[PDB]
Design a protein around this ligand. Sequence first.
Ligand SMILES: [Mg+2]
Ligand SMILES: [Mg+2]
Ligand SMILES: [Mg+2]
Ligand SMILES: [Mg+2]
Ligand SMILES: [Mg+2]
Ligand SMILES: [Mg+2]
Ligand SMILES: [Mg+2]
Ligand SMILES: [Mg+2]
Ligand SMILES: [Mg+2]
Ligand SMILES: [Mg+2]
Ligand SMILES: [Mg+2]
Ligand SMILES: [Mg+2]
Ligand SMILES: [Mg+2]
Ligand SMILES: [Mg+2]
Ligand SMILES: [Mg+2]
Ligand SMILES: [Mg+2]
Ligand SMILES: [Mg+2]
Ligand SMILES: [Mg+2]
Ligand SMILES: [Mg+2]
Ligand SMILES: [Mg+2]
Ligand SMILES: [Mg+2]
Ligand SMILES: [Mg+2]
Ligand SMILES: [Mg+2]
Ligand SMILES: [Mg+2]
Ligand SMILES: [Mg+2]
Ligand SMILES: [Mg+2]
Ligand SMILES: [Mg+2]
Ligand SMILES: [Mg+2]
Ligand SMILES: [Mg+2]
Ligand SMILES: [Mg+2]
Ligand SMILES: [Mg+2]
Ligand SMILES: [Mg+2]
Ligand SMILES: [Mg+2]
Ligand SMILES: [Mg+2]
Ligand SMILES: [Mg+2]
Ligand SMILES: [Mg+2]
Ligand SMILES: [Mg+2]
Ligand SMILES: [Mg+2]
Ligand SMILES: [Mg+2]
Ligand SMILES: [Mg+2]
Ligand SMILES: [Mg+2]
Ligand SMILES: [Mg+2]
Ligand SMILES: [Mg+2]
Ligand SMILES: [Mg+2]
Ligand SMILES: [Mg+2]
Ligand SMILES: [Mg+2]
Ligand SMILES: [Mg+2]
Ligand SMILES: [Mg+2]
Ligand SMILES: [Mg+2]
Ligand SMILES: [Mg+2]
Ligand SMILES: [Mg+2]
Ligand SMILES: [Mg+2]
Ligand SMILES: [Mg+2]
Ligand SMILES: [Mg+2]
Ligand SMILES: [Mg+2]
Ligand SMILES: [Mg+2]
Ligand SMILES: [Mg+2]
Ligand SMILES: [Mg+2]
Ligand SMILES: [Mg+2]
Ligand SMILES: [Mg+2]
Ligand SMILES: [Mg+2]
Ligand SMILES: [Mg+2]
Ligand SMILES: [Mg+2]
Ligand SMILES: [Mg+2]
Ligand SMILES: [Mg+2]
Ligand SMILES: [Mg+2]
Ligand SMILES: [Mg+2]
Ligand SMILES: [Mg+2]
Ligand SMILES: [Mg+2]
Ligand SMILES: [Mg+2]
Ligand SMILES: [Mg+2]
Ligand SMILES: [Mg+2]
Ligand SMILES: [Mg+2]
Ligand SMILES: [Mg+2]
Ligand SMILES: [Mg+2]
Ligand SMILES: [Mg+2]
Ligand SMILES: [Mg+2]
Ligand SMILES: [Mg+2]
Ligand SMILES: [Mg+2]
Ligand SMILES: [Mg+2]
Ligand SMILES: [Mg+2]
Ligand SMILES: [Mg+2]
Ligand SMILES: [Mg+2]
Ligand SMILES: [Mg+2]
Ligand SMILES: [Mg+2]
Ligand SMILES: [Mg+2]
Ligand SMILES: [Mg+2]
Ligand SMILES: [Mg+2]
Ligand SMILES: [Mg+2]
Ligand SMILES: [Mg+2]
Ligand SMILES: [Mg+2]
Ligand SMILES: [Mg+2]
Ligand SMILES: [Mg+2]
Ligand SMILES: [Mg+2]
Ligand SMILES: [Mg+2]
Ligand SMILES: [Mg+2]
Ligand SMILES: [Mg+2]
Ligand SMILES: [Mg+2]
Ligand SMILES: [Mg+2]
Ligand SMILES: [Mg+2]
Ligand SMILES: [Mg+2]
Ligand SMILES: [Mg+2]
Ligand SMILES: [Mg+2]
Ligand SMILES: [Mg+2]
Ligand SMILES: [Mg+2]
Ligand SMILES: [Mg+2]
Ligand SMILES: [Mg+2]
Ligand SMILES: [Mg+2]
Ligand SMILES: [Mg+2]
Ligand SMILES: [Mg+2]
Ligand SMILES: [Mg+2]
Ligand SMILES: [Mg+2]
Ligand SMILES: [Mg+2]
Ligand SMILES: [Mg+2]
Ligand SMILES: [Mg+2]
Ligand SMILES: [Mg+2]
Ligand SMILES: [Mg+2]
Ligand SMILES: [Mg+2]
Ligand SMILES: [Mg+2]
Ligand SMILES: [Mg+2]
Ligand SMILES: [Mg+2]
Ligand SMILES: [Mg+2]
Ligand SMILES: [Mg+2]
Ligand SMILES: [Mg+2]
Ligand SMILES: [Mg+2]
Ligand SMILES: [Mg+2]
Ligand SMILES: [Mg+2]
Ligand SMILES: [Mg+2]
Ligand SMILES: [Mg+2]
Ligand SMILES: [Mg+2]
Ligand SMILES: [Mg+2]
Ligand SMILES: [Mg+2]
Ligand SMILES: [Mg+2]
Ligand SMILES: [Mg+2]
Ligand SMILES: [Mg+2]
Ligand SMILES: [Mg+2]
Ligand SMILES: [Mg+2]
Ligand SMILES: [Mg+2]
Ligand SMILES: [Mg+2]
Ligand SMILES: [Mg+2]
Ligand SMILES: [Mg+2]
Ligand SMILES: [Mg+2]
Ligand SMILES: [Mg+2]
Ligand SMILES: [Mg+2]
Ligand SMILES: [Mg+2]
Ligand SMILES: [Mg+2]
Ligand SMILES: [Mg+2]
Ligand SMILES: [Mg+2]
Ligand SMILES: [Mg+2]
Ligand SMILES: [Mg+2]
Ligand SMILES: [Mg+2]
Ligand SMILES: [Mg+2]
Ligand SMILES: [Mg+2]
Ligand SMILES: [Mg+2]
Ligand SMILES: [Mg+2]
Ligand SMILES: [Mg+2]
Ligand SMILES: [Mg+2]
Ligand SMILES: [Mg+2]
Ligand SMILES: [Mg+2]
Ligand SMILES: [Mg+2]
Ligand SMILES: [Mg+2]
Ligand SMILES: [Mg+2]
Ligand SMILES: [Mg+2]
Ligand SMILES: [Mg+2]
Ligand SMILES: [Mg+2]
Ligand SMILES: [Mg+2]
Lengths: 64, 115, 200, 143
Amino acid sequence: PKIKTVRGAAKRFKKTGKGGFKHKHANLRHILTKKATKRKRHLRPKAMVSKGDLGLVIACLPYA
Amino acid sequence: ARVKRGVIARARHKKILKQAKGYYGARSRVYRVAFQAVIKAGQYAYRDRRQRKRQFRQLWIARINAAARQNGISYSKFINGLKKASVEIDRKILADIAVFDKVAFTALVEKAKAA
Amino acid sequence: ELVLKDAQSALTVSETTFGRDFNEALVHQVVVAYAAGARQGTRAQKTRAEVTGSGKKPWRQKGTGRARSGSIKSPIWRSGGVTFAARPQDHSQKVNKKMYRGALKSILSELVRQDRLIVVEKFSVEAPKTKLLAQKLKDMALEDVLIITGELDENLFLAARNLHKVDVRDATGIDPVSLIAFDKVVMTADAVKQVEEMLA
Amino acid sequence: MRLNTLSPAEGSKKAGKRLGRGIGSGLGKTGGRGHKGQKSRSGGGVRRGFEGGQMPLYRRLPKFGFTSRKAAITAEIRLSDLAKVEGGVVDLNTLKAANIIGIQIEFAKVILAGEVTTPVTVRGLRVTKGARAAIEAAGGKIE
RNA sequence: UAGCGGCGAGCGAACGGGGAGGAGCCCAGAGCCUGAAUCAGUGUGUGUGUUAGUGGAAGCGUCUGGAAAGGCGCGCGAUACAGGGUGACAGCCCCGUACACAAAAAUGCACAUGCUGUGAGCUCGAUGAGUAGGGCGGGACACGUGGUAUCCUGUCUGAAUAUGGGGGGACCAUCCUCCAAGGCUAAAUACUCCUGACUGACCGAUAGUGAACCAGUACCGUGAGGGAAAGGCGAAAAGAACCCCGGCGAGGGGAGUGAAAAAGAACCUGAAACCGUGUACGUACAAGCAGUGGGAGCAUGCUUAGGCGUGUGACUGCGUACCUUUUGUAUAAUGGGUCAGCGACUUAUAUUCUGUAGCAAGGUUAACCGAAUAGGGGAGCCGAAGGGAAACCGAGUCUUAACU
Ligand SMILES: [Mg+2]
Ligand SMILES: [Mg+2]
Ligand SMILES: [Mg+2]
Ligand SMILES: [Mg+2]
Ligand SMILES: [Mg+2]
Ligand SMILES: [Mg+2]
Ligand SMILES: [Mg+2]
Ligand SMILES: [Mg+2]
Ligand SMILES: [Mg+2]
Ligand SMILES: [Mg+2]
Ligand SMILES: [Mg+2]
Ligand SMILES: [Mg+2]
Ligand SMILES: [Mg+2]
Ligand SMILES: [Mg+2]
Ligand SMILES: [Mg+2]
Ligand SMILES: [Mg+2]
Ligand SMILES: [Mg+2]
Ligand SMILES: [Mg+2]
Ligand SMILES: [Mg+2]
Ligand SMILES: [Mg+2]
Ligand SMILES: [Mg+2]
Ligand SMILES: [Mg+2]
Ligand SMILES: [Mg+2]
Ligand SMILES: [Mg+2]
Ligand SMILES: [Mg+2]
Ligand SMILES: [Mg+2]
Ligand SMILES: [Mg+2]
Ligand SMILES: [Mg+2]
Ligand SMILES: [Mg+2]
Ligand SMILES: [Mg+2]
Ligand SMILES: [Mg+2]
Ligand SMILES: [Mg+2]
Ligand SMILES: [Mg+2]
Ligand SMILES: [Mg+2]
Ligand SMILES: [Mg+2]
Ligand SMILES: [Mg+2]
Ligand SMILES: [Mg+2]
Ligand SMILES: [Mg+2]
Ligand SMILES: [Mg+2]
Ligand SMILES: [Mg+2]
Ligand SMILES: [Mg+2]
Ligand SMILES: [Mg+2]
Ligand SMILES: [Mg+2]
Ligand SMILES: [Mg+2]
Ligand SMILES: [Mg+2]
Ligand SMILES: [Mg+2]
Ligand SMILES: [Mg+2]
Ligand SMILES: [Mg+2]
Ligand SMILES: [Mg+2]
Ligand SMILES: [Mg+2]
Ligand SMILES: [Mg+2]
Ligand SMILES: [Mg+2]
Ligand SMILES: [Mg+2]
Ligand SMILES: [Mg+2]
Ligand SMILES: [Mg+2]
Ligand SMILES: [Mg+2]
Ligand SMILES: [Mg+2]
Ligand SMILES: [Mg+2]
Ligand SMILES: [Mg+2]
Ligand SMILES: [Mg+2]
Ligand SMILES: [Mg+2]
Ligand SMILES: [Mg+2]
Ligand SMILES: [Mg+2]
Ligand SMILES: [Mg+2]
Ligand SMILES: [Mg+2]
Ligand SMILES: [Mg+2]
Ligand SMILES: [Mg+2]
Ligand SMILES: [Mg+2]
Ligand SMILES: [Mg+2]
Ligand SMILES: [Mg+2]
Ligand SMILES: [Mg+2]
Ligand SMILES: [Mg+2]
Ligand SMILES: [Mg+2]
Ligand SMILES: [Mg+2]
Ligand SMILES: [Mg+2]
Ligand SMILES: [Mg+2]
Ligand SMILES: [Mg+2]
Ligand SMILES: [Mg+2]
Ligand SMILES: [Mg+2]
Ligand SMILES: [Mg+2]
Ligand SMILES: [Mg+2]
Ligand SMILES: [Mg+2]
Ligand SMILES: [Mg+2]
Ligand SMILES: [Mg+2]
Ligand SMILES: [Mg+2]
Ligand SMILES: [Mg+2]
Ligand SMILES: [Mg+2]
Ligand SMILES: [Mg+2]
Ligand SMILES: [Mg+2]
Ligand SMILES: [Mg+2]
Ligand SMILES: [Mg+2]
Ligand SMILES: [Mg+2]
Ligand SMILES: [Mg+2]
Ligand SMILES: [Mg+2]
Ligand SMILES: [Mg+2]
Ligand SMILES: [Mg+2]
Ligand SMILES: [Mg+2]
Ligand SMILES: [Mg+2]
Ligand SMILES: [Mg+2]
Ligand SMILES: [Mg+2]
Ligand SMILES: [Mg+2]
Ligand SMILES: [Mg+2]
Ligand SMILES: [Mg+2]
Ligand SMILES: [Mg+2]
Ligand SMILES: [Mg+2]
Ligand SMILES: [Mg+2]
Ligand SMILES: [Mg+2]
Ligand SMILES: [Mg+2]
Ligand SMILES: [Mg+2]
Ligand SMILES: [Mg+2]
Ligand SMILES: [Mg+2]
Ligand SMILES: [Mg+2]
Ligand SMILES: [Mg+2]
Ligand SMILES: [Mg+2]
Ligand SMILES: [Mg+2]
Ligand SMILES: [Mg+2]
Ligand SMILES: [Mg+2]
Ligand SMILES: [Mg+2]
Ligand SMILES: [Mg+2]
Ligand SMILES: [Mg+2]
Ligand SMILES: [Mg+2]
Ligand SMILES: [Mg+2]
Ligand SMILES: [Mg+2]
Ligand SMILES: [Mg+2]
Ligand SMILES: [Mg+2]
Ligand SMILES: [Mg+2]
Ligand SMILES: [Mg+2]
Ligand SMILES: [Mg+2]
Ligand SMILES: [Mg+2]
Ligand SMILES: [Mg+2]
Ligand SMILES: [Mg+2]
Ligand SMILES: [Mg+2]
Ligand SMILES: [Mg+2]
Ligand SMILES: [Mg+2]
Ligand SMILES: [Mg+2]
Ligand SMILES: [Mg+2]
Ligand SMILES: [Mg+2]
Ligand SMILES: [Mg+2]
Ligand SMILES: [Mg+2]
Ligand SMILES: [Mg+2]
Ligand SMILES: [Mg+2]
Ligand SMILES: [Mg+2]
Ligand SMILES: [Mg+2]
Ligand SMILES: [Mg+2]
Ligand SMILES: [Mg+2]
Ligand SMILES: [Mg+2]
Ligand SMILES: [Mg+2]
Ligand SMILES: [Mg+2]
Ligand SMILES: [Mg+2]
Ligand SMILES: [Mg+2]
Ligand SMILES: [Mg+2]
Ligand SMILES: [Mg+2]
Ligand SMILES: [Mg+2]
Ligand SMILES: [Mg+2]
Ligand SMILES: [Mg+2]
Ligand SMILES: [Mg+2]
Ligand SMILES: [Mg+2]
Ligand SMILES: [Mg+2]
Ligand SMILES: [Mg+2]
Ligand SMILES: [Mg+2]
Ligand SMILES: [Mg+2]
Ligand SMILES: [Mg+2]
Ligand SMILES: [Mg+2]
Ligand SMILES: [Mg+2]
Ligand SMILES: [Mg+2]
Ligand SMILES: [Mg+2]
């Protein structure tokens, strides 16, 4: 049979042109008044997945 | 394709049992025991090729040290005396001369005396 | 061009079909694949599930001074198991159109070098009889052959069943293994024209 | 070439790792899977994205976005594969027959992928700024 | 994939497309006119097919051997060199095989068509109420009540009835589309207890069915149920008449058969463990993984008028088995009485990476038609373009009011 995509991972990552994955940052859902604006600004944009945990993403979704 | 393996195994066992030919008890006639003895024999064989060279040197040196003290010189002085007179002759031959040609050997000790 | 043995006519056949470098790997792969396609692969042993018997423990786990056993059917036991029992499987393997054509082009070109390819004009026995076909090959100086024809004559077909070393196949139905296997290849002028168009 | 004389290309085949066949094989006894542990066992190893009970990366990061439905029924046509239809008329049904875009694609767009030669009148189709410069420089008038 | 999902584990569509196969009708009823389409039988026609079958080609001589099909040398049939048998491997010795013919009788088919028996086609009328829908509780839909359409309903209710209603995924309105609440319908599709024929990069007696053999037997169990072991003399029984020892025995030894009887029925081959008989050397003052390097003697072979090989191994330096598990094992930690046989990284489909072969901005087909490993069939897939949550823009675009 075909491989089943880890759906949870499909909705949190997205494959860029080179091969790596973009993801949204943590710590930007609730408890924000105590957080400084500089944090909340830096956490707003999408960010690339690190080298260490790339293989864990690549396995979770083999069809990109 | 099924591979019945009765022909190959027997030839493997029979090859090793032939190497164990001579040993006492089960060692000669029982593969499972033989195989250990045959390996150990190899282990000891690899070792004693190194010891052959050590033992024979000791054996020669003993003969030279025996034959020198007949003529009144200790082995330690004899060899130093030969090396000061720059004689390249080894222990193997010195020991063989010391046994066979005594009249010859005497001249080597008389040469070692000079230095 | 390709000369004949009873005319000496210049059949101008294409360059890249009958005159290309012999690629060994491609041919090997295609003939191996053709062999692999011939297999039916109908065979089955029975796994420890499929063996007849009970799932009862022959003796209890502990207490008895014996090696813990779970069933009679386990492959370490006698009379049942075969750990990795094979099932009826399809051994046929895919070959690419361009690779199959490339391989035919490759082998069929090498027959021109080795002179196994004996191209001819009309080749057909008088009546459906083996005795005539057997006698007429002695004049042609042949024995083990693949007589490829465009217009497949029943006369010629029936006359070559019982002959072992002769095989009559239609120009449409040429194979990689056959062109390699047989010692000479007798092609009809129409068959060359058909195969030329087929392989292209 | 005879049926025996054939051989594969050097580098084609590579045997295969046969585990559990003596010391001389290299791998053999614990066939390349070490001593003990979950990974060594038959049916061993953990599932995908399992970091030993720690919250996995695909759960500790927030999900985002939504899958667009309009994005499924739109194509990105190359400027290279433009003049491959019917002289120089590329609406949608014409382009669809040429097998450049799928059947269920209503909207579509022509982008600057390079190279035009013939004059092609691109009707009933969205077209890019750089493509509009090229297609008109070739000859064909858009819309 | 879209979705569903302690949005975890996991589950997983439809639209649209390519194929195989194609076929539609009856009722909730009134006119003239009526056996004419239709089938459902009794049938009638060939063609059969099937359950018995018939014919069916052409080789000899030497050599080896127990025996010829073998070798060697010359023939001949072949729409028959599939295959099995025959004293070793047979185109031509036999049974078959290809090919041409068959059925008194029973039957399973496909068309004429006499027909107890059935209604044409055709205007009109009809169009399925405790129903659809709703509340409550469950279930089925990929869809876990979720914003949940759709269908099935246990329960309580309740329309319009074709200016009517259903649906188009909360819902509403416009458009489009269908017509529920009654029925019957072949083919493509699934299966093989069973009957043939044929084929295996299937097994060859610890395998293959549990079962090659009087096996679902012996035996075990109150019973449900479990469940074995056990193949081969030889070409042909020519299976050893007859003597001898012994208990008018078992068992042997001669004779005789046969190519052979260590092929004599406990019967092809006959390994190992294990147990003997005889020959050579060593062995009753000598300590230990029993070997290993050194090495006298003694016993045997060869050719030479001197040296080697083989067996043995007095004496002597070194030397604590193997596996496992371990920081670490001679360990007094694990496992093995020994031998023989069997016994463990596989198979299928998806996926990424390495090598290799093809073709190259292209590559490539899937099912399927195919007498078929060709050739069609590019439905699709993947690539050549990305950014963005998305509309959207695109060699740029996102971010932002805007970007040096
Ligand atoms: Mg938020
Ligand atoms: Mg602050
Ligand atoms: Mg790293
Ligand atoms: Mg995909
Ligand atoms: Mg063999
Ligand atoms: Mg043995
Ligand atoms: Mg060997
Ligand atoms: Mg021995
Ligand atoms: Mg000895
Ligand atoms: Mg022996
Ligand atoms: Mg030394
Ligand atoms: Mg040294
Ligand atoms: Mg090449
Ligand atoms: Mg059970
Ligand atoms: Mg139970
Ligand atoms: Mg015990
Ligand atoms: Mg079995
Ligand atoms: Mg394979
Ligand atoms: Mg394969
Ligand atoms: Mg041949
Ligand atoms: Mg034949
Ligand atoms: Mg051949
Ligand atoms: Mg063609
Ligand atoms: Mg073509
Ligand atoms: Mg190469
Ligand atoms: Mg290699
Ligand atoms: Mg393998
Ligand atoms: Mg492997
Ligand atoms: Mg390796
Ligand atoms: Mg290693
Ligand atoms: Mg490893
Ligand atoms: Mg270890
Ligand atoms: Mg272990
Ligand atoms: Mg450990
Ligand atoms: Mg490990
Ligand atoms: Mg694994
Ligand atoms: Mg891993
Ligand atoms: Mg397409
Ligand atoms: Mg389910
Ligand atoms: Mg499914
Ligand atoms: Mg589906
Ligand atoms: Mg279709
Ligand atoms: Mg169709
Ligand atoms: Mg369809
Ligand atoms: Mg039709
Ligand atoms: Mg029709
Ligand atoms: Mg009849
Ligand atoms: Mg008849
Ligand atoms: Mg006959
Ligand atoms: Mg004769
Ligand atoms: Mg004779
Ligand atoms: Mg004779
Ligand atoms: Mg004779
Ligand atoms: Mg005789
Ligand atoms: Mg003869
Ligand atoms: Mg002959
Ligand atoms: Mg021969
Ligand atoms: Mg035969
Ligand atoms: Mg036979
Ligand atoms: Mg014989
Ligand atoms: Mg025979
Ligand atoms: Mg032969
Ligand atoms: Mg022969
Ligand atoms: Mg013959
Ligand atoms: Mg035969
Ligand atoms: Mg012959
Ligand atoms: Mg017949
Ligand atoms: Mg008849
Ligand atoms: Mg008949
Ligand atoms: Mg008749
Ligand atoms: Mg009759
Ligand atoms: Mg009659
Ligand atoms: Mg009658
Ligand atoms: Mg009758
Ligand atoms: Mg009958
Ligand atoms: Mg019928
Ligand atoms: Mg409804
Ligand atoms: Mg209802
Ligand atoms: Mg509702
Ligand atoms: Mg309420
Ligand atoms: Mg409800
Ligand atoms: Mg449900
Ligand atoms: Mg459900
Ligand atoms: Mg379900
Ligand atoms: Mg939801
Ligand atoms: Mg909500
Ligand atoms: Mg609705
Ligand atoms: Mg509802
Ligand atoms: Mg639905
Ligand atoms: Mg109801
Ligand atoms: Mg009431
Ligand atoms: Mg009412
Ligand atoms: Mg009301
Ligand atoms: Mg109306
Ligand atoms: Mg109407
Ligand atoms: Mg209305
Ligand atoms: Mg409506
Ligand atoms: Mg809607
Ligand atoms: Mg829908
Ligand atoms: Mg729907
Ligand atoms: Mg209104
Ligand atoms: Mg309305
Ligand atoms: Mg209706
Ligand atoms: Mg109705
Ligand atoms: Mg009813
Ligand atoms: Mg209906
Ligand atoms: Mg059909
Ligand atoms: Mg076999
Ligand atoms: Mg058996
Ligand atoms: Mg047996
Ligand atoms: Mg046997
Ligand atoms: Mg059983
Ligand atoms: Mg059994
Ligand atoms: Mg009983
Ligand atoms: Mg027999
Ligand atoms: Mg026997
Ligand atoms: Mg007798
Ligand atoms: Mg008597
Ligand atoms: Mg008596
Ligand atoms: Mg008595
Ligand atoms: Mg008597
Ligand atoms: Mg008597
Ligand atoms: Mg008697
Ligand atoms: Mg007797
Ligand atoms: Mg007797
Ligand atoms: Mg006799
Ligand atoms: Mg005789
Ligand atoms: Mg004789
Ligand atoms: Mg004998
Ligand atoms: Mg005898
Ligand atoms: Mg006897
Ligand atoms: Mg007897
Ligand atoms: Mg016996
Ligand atoms: Mg025999
Ligand atoms: Mg025997
Ligand atoms: Mg023996
Ligand atoms: Mg003594
Ligand atoms: Mg003594
Ligand atoms: Mg002692
Ligand atoms: Mg000793
Ligand atoms: Mg020695
Ligand atoms: Mg010596
Ligand atoms: Mg002697
Ligand atoms: Mg020698
Ligand atoms: Mg003595
Ligand atoms: Mg010591
Ligand atoms: Mg342990
Ligand atoms: Mg410990
Ligand atoms: Mg130690
Ligand atoms: Mg110990
Ligand atoms: Mg121990
Ligand atoms: Mg321990
Ligand atoms: Mg322990
Ligand atoms: Mg152990
Ligand atoms: Mg033990
Ligand atoms: Mg594996
Ligand atoms: Mg690559
Ligand atoms: Mg090309
Ligand atoms: Mg190239
Ligand atoms: Mg057909
Ligand atoms: Mg096409
Ligand atoms: Mg790919
Ligand atoms: Mg694409
Ligand atoms: Mg490019
Ligand atoms: Mg894009
Ligand atoms: Mg903005």
